[PDB]
């Protein structure tokens, strides 16, 4: 099985124990780890942050602890403008310069790989996302003539049937890409004035409306689409998304008037690390939602959808249940990657628990 765990570059900037770099990985943790986020200058892919050239040193030697162990590098992320990227995907001269430019920047830096992170092609856009795919591909191919391994070639893919059916053709993408990471943790948040979880696994019998928010649903629909399935990684957060709570009411379909407060170390109002959680749980009154198998928790104006280790366990046993490739972790800096906040001695509790059940199965 796979276990492919994304560290964040701006996670480095957070005051105190927030503070999280490549350093701070367990070797042995995953089979791969992707430093998210490149930009992309000149139509080159590049830097992002003033030290990463330093960075990504210290995440690749990690490699002397664990020669096995995979690193990747992703380009775009939300602060990319989708738009941007489009611009360069759609010309022929753009996209041939980009595309020339990876392979000696991933050599040069020691990665082995490269993740696409165009985050969310317009319906314009699916066309030349099915050509840039392809051409990377090619290219590292052709690269590997030279004797060294060849690059791998992921791609993050949103997992809300209009974004899929928008702007990916799966069937075509799924041939040229090594895996394919399920983005299965927005399946809410703030747009709606109402409370409502994120990750639900299972669609739960009691709303209609939306039975294609859950990751069940957007599993079994990339299945149908042509995605083999030993090609396919689910997504499994670990942070939490908060709101403030409109009314005393705290059930299913309480109302909402907006994002909740910031946290002490993550400062972004919307979201919390599991860290924070563990922390925010302290005199908060505790619920799950049987049908979703996913937990949330309020305390005062504040409500909080989040996954714990059991709601984590549980997603990695149905993953392993239909087969799939393995899993995905969005942030092991937003787990408790220090492992002094959430009571067990135990670094990175969310995933080390999903490792434990892919290790069993
Ligand atoms: C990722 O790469 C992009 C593209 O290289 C980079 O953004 C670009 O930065 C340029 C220089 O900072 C911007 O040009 C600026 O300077 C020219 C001439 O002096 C002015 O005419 C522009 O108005 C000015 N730009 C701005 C926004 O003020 C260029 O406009 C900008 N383009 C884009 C699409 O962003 C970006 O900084 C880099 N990301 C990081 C984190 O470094």
Redesign the pocket.
């Given at each position: 099985y796979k276990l492919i765990c994304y560290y964040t570059s701006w996670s480095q900037y957070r005051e105190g124990d927030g503070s999280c770099f490549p350093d701070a990985i367990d070797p042995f943790l995953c089979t791969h780890v992707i430093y998210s986020f490149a930009?992309?200058?000149?139509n080159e892919i590049?830097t992002?942050e003033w030290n990463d050239v330093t960075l990504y040193d210290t995440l690749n030697t990690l490699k002397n602890r664990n020669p096995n162990l995979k690193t990747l590098l992703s380009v775009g992320g939300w602060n990319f403008?989708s738009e941007?990227f489009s611009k360069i995907a759609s010309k022929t001269q753009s996209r041939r310069t980009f595309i020339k430019s990876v392979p000696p920047f991933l050599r040069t830096h020691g990665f082995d790989g490269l993740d696409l992170a165009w985050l969310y092609p317009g319906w314009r856009d699916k066309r030349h996302l099915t050509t840039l795919v392809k051409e990377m591909k090619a290219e590292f191919v052709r690269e590997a003539q030279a004797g060294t391994e060849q690059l791998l070639l992921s791609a993050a893919v949103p997992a809300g049937k209009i974004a899929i059916d928008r702007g990916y053709d799966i069937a075509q993408i799924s041939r040229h890409l090594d895996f394919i990471s399920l983005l299965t943790y927005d399946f809410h948040g703030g747009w709606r004035g109402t409370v409502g979880h994120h990750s639900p696994l299972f669609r739960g019998n009691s709303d209609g409306s939306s039975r294609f928010s859950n990751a069940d649903y957007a599993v079994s629909y990339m299945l149908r689409l042509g995605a083999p399935a030993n090609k396919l990684v689910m997504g499994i957060p670990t942070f939490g998304r908060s709101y403030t709570l409109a009314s005393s009411k705290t059930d299913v379909g309480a109302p909402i008037s907006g994002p909740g407060i910031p946290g002490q170390f993550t400062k972004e109002k919307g979201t919390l690390a599991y860290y924070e959680i563990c922390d925010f749980l302290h005199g908060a009154t505790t619920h799950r939602f049987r049908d979703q198998q996913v937990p949330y928790a309020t305390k005062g104006n504040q409500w909080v959808a989040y996954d714990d280790q059991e709601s984590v366990k549980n997603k990695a046993r149905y993953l392993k249940n239909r087969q799939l490739a393995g899993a995905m972790v969005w942030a092991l800096d937003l787990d408790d990657f220090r492992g002094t906040f959430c009571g067990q001695n135990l670094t990175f509790p969310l995933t080390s628990a999903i490792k434990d059940v892919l290790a069993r199965v």
């Open positions: 930009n992309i200058s000149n590049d992002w403008g941007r």
